Design goal:
The structure holds three protein chains of three kinds. By secondary structure, chain A is mostly helical. Chain A is built from six helices and two strands; from the N terminus they run αααβαβαα. Classes of the chains: A mainly alpha, B alpha+beta, C mainly alpha. Chain A: A motif (Diacidic) lies at residues 110-111.
Chain lengths: 139, 142, 388
């Protein structure tokens, strides 16, 4: 998936609804992100790549607080983070060969609400700015 | 000071244990069991610290393993919390993508690592570079 | 490495039942006992390998009735791997048996005498791990000399400082304050931060029983603390943790400072206050890293500095700022930080000067009491209320 592909050069560009929507699809077309477990290092890696290649300053990708689904502040970004069910986390961590520092093993240390999160793609986010509705304070 | 370091898997098998205080086997076993009870039941919702009458527990979970440092009440909660990660990261670098299995097969080596980083109930070496360099040097030795 | 050990561990894993595990284990114990009381003198590798297997069995929870002698023999070995396994063994399985203790102590003596730093660290650690009264008697006199001597390697210095700490804790009487004390304080100035880290722990414990001897440390620590917090990432590359410079040494120096009242020399007192002001400022600065390791490292220092501020009750402006930052933390999304803030503020309430500032947040606290899911945090909030 694209996280493998990612894992300054270009001039600055503003983040716009068009920018975010195109970007969402650009990542989907390159395969990836959907279903992928969230870790701060991963997003940092992602934010940087977008930043270096496509000149979007890594400030745009923010989500509503937990617990529960975390919704993107930038309108037209079609990726929400949703919490993994506990039983799913435990089954994934089963076994003595799983890496200690793999994102699923961290158990949401990166998250203040300590929830394990995965990226999921939503069509609706392009049409409806869920973050604004839920938290006008941020807007 | 650090009363004792514990590395325990979810099942309750003890991967590592360092005692920096005197305990008799009856006490240790009660402690191991007591510590397991608290962390497995305790969730994400909860803080990383658990409070005892005499002692405090700082613990963090990686994979199937619970890393627990037991300290006196006045000790720095956050510092020891991050000391655990510093330790895990050193282990990660050392075993190259460390996992619980590595801790079992190379158990005699994990003691070496802990001792570089913690000694006498205190923090010893906090530089990943220096611990790793020393760890590498020793490998060369017969 | 040692293949035979790996195979014995795999075999234990492969066991399907507790009983099968016992059977395999008893087989090994018998196979080993056979070799030790065996006609053949054992080569260095096998003796090291078998003693390792015995240890595994011990860690497995089965008591071990033999193999102590062999471990002592490994202690004599000039090969490091052999020496490390033996020392590990006597550390885990400690005997009251006097015959063994004399043999062990001789082994340690040989290593400390040897100029090799690696052997010294094995010997030094062993004393620390075991920390027996008998062991204290043997080396309590010797260890400070090793620590205090120049020409002693840094790594030896680190373990030396901590090892003496163990001796002092275990057998305070055998460790009297002497001349090594002055040199230990200047150990705080050492180029190697690892040494400084270890030295500071020794000093902090020593200063508690005997403060007068080590007030010289106060001035020294304040100077290093100030230097460390302002330190650039390129200057301390080795000891910078996620863009935080020496978080753990900084914490330790602040706790040392808590033993003493404010520094007698005003110049030092000024340097300290400017340092604490800096630390507080860094909190509000925009974060260099989004990662939690950065925050935990950074905040751990802050909370220790706040702890010093509260302890002294010395500087009003600082006490005021301290109250402010903690108040900001009550709102923080992380359960961990709110818990710690509630604790610290609770202490802060006791200060007469700052009491009224703390009462400001009573509503914030009560609001938490209504919405806080964590039971532990609820207690530390109820505790704050009674404080006011």
């Amino acid at each position: 998936x694209x996280x493998x592909x990612x894992x300054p050069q270009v001039p600055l560009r503003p983040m716009t609804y068009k920018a975010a929507v195109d970007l969402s699809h650009f990542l989907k077309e390159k395969g990836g992100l959907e279903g992928l477990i969230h870790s701060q290092r991963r997003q940092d890696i992602l934010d940087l790549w977008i930043y270096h290649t496509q000149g979007y300053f890594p400030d745009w990708q923010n989500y509503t607080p937990g617990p529960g689904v975390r919704y993107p502040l930038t309108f037209g970004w079609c990726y929400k983070l949703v919490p993994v069910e506990p039983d799913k986390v435990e089954e994934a961590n089963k076994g003595e060969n799983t890496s200690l520092l793999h994102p699923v093993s961290l158990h949401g240390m990166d998250d203040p609400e300590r929830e394990v999160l995965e990226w999921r793609f939503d069509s609706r986010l392009a049409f409806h700015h869920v973050a604004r509705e839920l938290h006008p304070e941020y807007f | 000071m650090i009363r004792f370091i514990l590395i325990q898997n979810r099942a309750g098998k003890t991967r590592l244990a360092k005692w920096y205080m005197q305990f008799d086997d009856d006490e240790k076993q009660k402690l191991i069991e007591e510590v397991h009870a608290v962390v497995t039941v305790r969730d994400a919702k909860h803080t990383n610290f658990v409070e005892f009458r005499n002692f405090k527990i700082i613990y963090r979970r990686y994979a199937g393993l619970y890393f627990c440092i037991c300290v006196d009440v006045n000790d720095n909660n956050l510092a020891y919390l991050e000391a655990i990660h510093n330790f895990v990261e050193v282990l990660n670098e050392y075993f190259h993508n460390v996992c619980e299995l590595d801790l079992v097969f190379n158990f005699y080596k994990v003691y070496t690592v802990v001792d570089e980083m913690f000694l006498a109930g205190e923090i010893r070496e906090t530089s990943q570079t220096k611990v790793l360099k020393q760890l590498l040097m020793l490998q060369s030795l017969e | 490495g040692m293949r035979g050990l790996a195979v014995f561990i795999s075999d234990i894993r492969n066991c399907k039942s507790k009983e099968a595990e016992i059977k395999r284990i008893n087989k090994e114990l018998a196979n080993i006992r056979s070799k030790f009381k065996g006609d053949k003198a054992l080569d260095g590798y096998s003796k090291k390998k078998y003693v390792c297997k015995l240890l595994f069995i011990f860690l497995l929870g089965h008591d071990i009735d033999f193999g102590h002698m062999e471990a002592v023999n490994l202690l004599s070995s000039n090969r490091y791997t052999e020496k490390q396994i033996g020392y590990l063994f006597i550390s885990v399985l400690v005997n009251s048996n006097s015959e063994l203790i004399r043999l062990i102590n001789n082994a340690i003596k040989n290593d400390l005498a040897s100029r090799n730093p690696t052997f010294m660290g094995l010997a030094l650690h062993c004393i620390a791990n075991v920390g027996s009264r008998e062991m204290a008697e043997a080396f309590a006199g010797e260890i400070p000399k090793i620590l205090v001597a120049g020409d002693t390697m840094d790594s030896v210095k680190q373990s030396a400082a901590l090892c003496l700490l163990r001796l002092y804790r275990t057998s305070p009487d055998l460790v009297p304050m002497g001349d090594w004390t002055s040199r230990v304080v200047h150990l705080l100035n050492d180029q190697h931060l690892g040494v400084v880290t270890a030295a500071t722990s020794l000093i902090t414990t020593l200063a508690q029983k005997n403060p007068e001897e080590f007030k010289t440390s106060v001035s020294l620590a304040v100077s290093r603390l100030s230097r460390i917090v302002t330190s650039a990432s390129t200057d301390l590359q080795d000891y910078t943790y996620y863009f935080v410079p020496a978080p753990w040494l900084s914490v330790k120096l602040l706790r040392l400072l808590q033993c003493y009242p404010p520094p007698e020399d005003p110049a030092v007192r000024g340097r300290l206050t400017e340092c604490l002001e800096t630390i507080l400022n860094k909190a509000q600065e925009p974060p260099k890293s989004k990662k939690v390791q950065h925050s935990n490292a950074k905040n751990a220092v802050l909370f220790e500095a706040i702890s010093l501020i509260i302890h002294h009750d010395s500087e009003p402006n600082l006490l005021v700022r301290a109250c402010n930052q903690l108040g900001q933390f009550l709102q923080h999304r992380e359960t961990n930080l709110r818990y710690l803030a509630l604790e610290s503020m609770c202490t802060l309430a006791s200060s007469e000067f700052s009491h009224e500032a703390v009462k400001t947040h009573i509503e914030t606290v009560i609001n938490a009491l209504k919405t806080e899911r964590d039971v532990s945090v609820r207690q530390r909030a109820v505790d704050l209320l009674y404080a006011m």
